[PDB]
Design a protein around this ligand. Structure first.
Ligand code: GDP
Length: 311
């Protein structure tokens, strides 16, 4: 309930809210309680990890997709930015945007864990320090909640809010060791798979895609290249998953195959051309033709859905 008092207090201020989310796991970056408490606050939506994006991705598409993805969740951002907190790409633009939309007031940086908030905030801390400012760590009116105060010119202050607010993203179902693998080191390379009806693709042991009906088709997989992919006929998919989970089908490692949540199936009918079958926290597979009939599996809570291709 400390996060609530915090969310309520920043709501009173009417100050600019910088909400940073992971573009590969937007659903796992949503903060249900944000627009409920921040209706009057102008919010800047920042999509981190843009450096892992395949060069074939068109920014305007992603831009419009995330605004639309946010719009759908009661969250109506004043603007949207794409940055790579790790590579410093797009950081200059996001700073100009922050100075513009805050006008003269403060700014609160909000976001769930594993989104890149600390890396993003570290770049600001480094710049502010180079300008002679003093950065302070203290308590946001709650207690357990640590906050970082970063002085902006003339009285105003940028505040880093508890990076916490963990939720139900793919990252939380994987232990530290295998999370490294799910996490890409560099830009994502396409992997083309020509599938026939009655075939299945396992992405590690984390998610599954069944090609139910539709004729020979090319699926282009866009996920962490360390993530091993396995293909088998639909009719043996369940038997394989029961015996190879933790072994051939990993992550998850055999260690915590007694933690791994059941994969929940969902039916999907691809009616439009050039679409992305999005697997939250993992990436997506692109179907360049319509008609596809599929069944997708992923842990409960992690969203799998289709959108107009970003490619
Ligand atoms: N590829 C890439 N990785 C990033 C980026 N920003 C953060 N990360 C990763 O996110 C991890 C840190 O997350 P932090 O620990 O920054 O997340 P936070 O605790 O919610 O603030 C690091 O291990 C980075 O590898 C980015 O812009 N690009």
């Amino acid at each position: 309930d400390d996060f609530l008092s915090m969310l309520h207090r920043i709501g009173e201020s009417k100050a600019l809210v910088v909400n940073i989310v992971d573009i590969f796991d937007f659903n796992g970056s949503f903060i249900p309680g944000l627009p409920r408490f921040a209706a009057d606050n102008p919010i800047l939506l920042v999509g981190n990890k843009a450096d892992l994006l395949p060069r074939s991705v068109k920014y305007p598409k992603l831009l419009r997709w995330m605004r639309r993805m946010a719009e759908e969740l009661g969250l109506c951002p004043v603007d949207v930015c794409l940055v790579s907190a790790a590579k410093g790409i797009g950081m200059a633009k996001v700073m100009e945007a922050i100075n513009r939309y805050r006008e003269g007031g403060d700014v609160y940086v909000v976001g769930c864990t594993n989104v890149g908030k600390s890396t993003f905030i570290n770049r600001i801390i480094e710049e502010a320090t180079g300008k002679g400012n003093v950065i302070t760590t203290s308590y946001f009116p709650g207690t357990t909640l640590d906050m970082i105060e970063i002085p902006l010119e003339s009285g105003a202050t940028l505040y880093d809010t508890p990076g916490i607010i963990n939720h139900h993203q793919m990252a939380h179902f994987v232990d530290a060791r295998d999370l490294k693998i799910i996490t890409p080191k560099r830009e994502i390379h396409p992997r083309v798979y020509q599938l026939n009806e009655g075939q299945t693709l396992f992405f590690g042991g984390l998610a599954r895609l069944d090609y139910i009906k539709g004729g020979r088709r090319s699926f282009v997989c866009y996920m962490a290249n360390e993530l091993t992919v396995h293909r088998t006929k639909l009719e043996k998919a369940d038997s394989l998953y029961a015996n190879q989970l933790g072994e051939l089908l990993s992550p998850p490692s055999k260690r915590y195959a007694a933690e791994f949540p059941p994969l929940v199936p969902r039916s999907l009918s691809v009616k439009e051309r050039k679409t992305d079958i999005v697997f939250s926290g993992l990436g997506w597979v692109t179907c360049n033709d319509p008609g596809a009939q599929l069944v997708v599996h992923a842990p409960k809570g992690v969203d799998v859905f289709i959108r107009q291709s970003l490619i």
